[PDB]
């Protein structure tokens, strides 16, 4: 009978092992034990992204944002979901928001957020070129 924290730690190990559906299931078990912890949802969202399930990832990002409206990772992963779902304007807004929140919170993710922003803007532009 593991604790919520033990379940999160197991999920994290499975994630390192690139066992994403297994990791996601572990985070689900953690959520069962304590559904008020934003990180369980953002971790699972990342798993769903790796599993090419942006719809499921998006719902987890929404759950995380309800718990912590300032979550950098929830905004970032939400943007990634929207990008995959070809909602480019929303994606860019969320990645920009992630960038702004990371700055406000004095968090350092190197060039990860700007790089994702560039990818999103490039994808947006390319979608326009694909239509003319």
């Amino acid at each position: 009978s593991p604790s919520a924290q033990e379940l999160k730690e197991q999920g994290n190990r499975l994630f390192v092992g690139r066992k994403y559906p297994e990791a996601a299931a572990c985070y689900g078990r953690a959520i069962t034990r304590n559904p008020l912890v934003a990180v369980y949802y953002t971790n699972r969202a990342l798993c769903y992204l790796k599993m090419q399930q942006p719809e499921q990832a998006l719902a987890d990002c929404r759950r995380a944002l309800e718990l912590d409206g300032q979550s950098v990772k929830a905004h970032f992963f939400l943007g990634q979901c929207q990008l995959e779902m070809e909602s480019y304007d929303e994606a860019i807004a969320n990645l920009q928001r992630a960038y702004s929140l990371a700055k406000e919170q004095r968090l350092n993710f190197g060039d990860d957020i700007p790089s994702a922003l560039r990818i999103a803007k490039k994808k947006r532009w390319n979608s326009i070129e694909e239509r003319r």
């Binding site: 999920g11 994290n12 994630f15 990180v39 953002t42 990342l46 990772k73 990860d112």
Partner: peptide, 6 residues
């Protein structure tokens, strides 16, 4: 990175 679990 940012794409990492916590």
């Amino acid at each position: 990175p940012i794409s990492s679990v916590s």
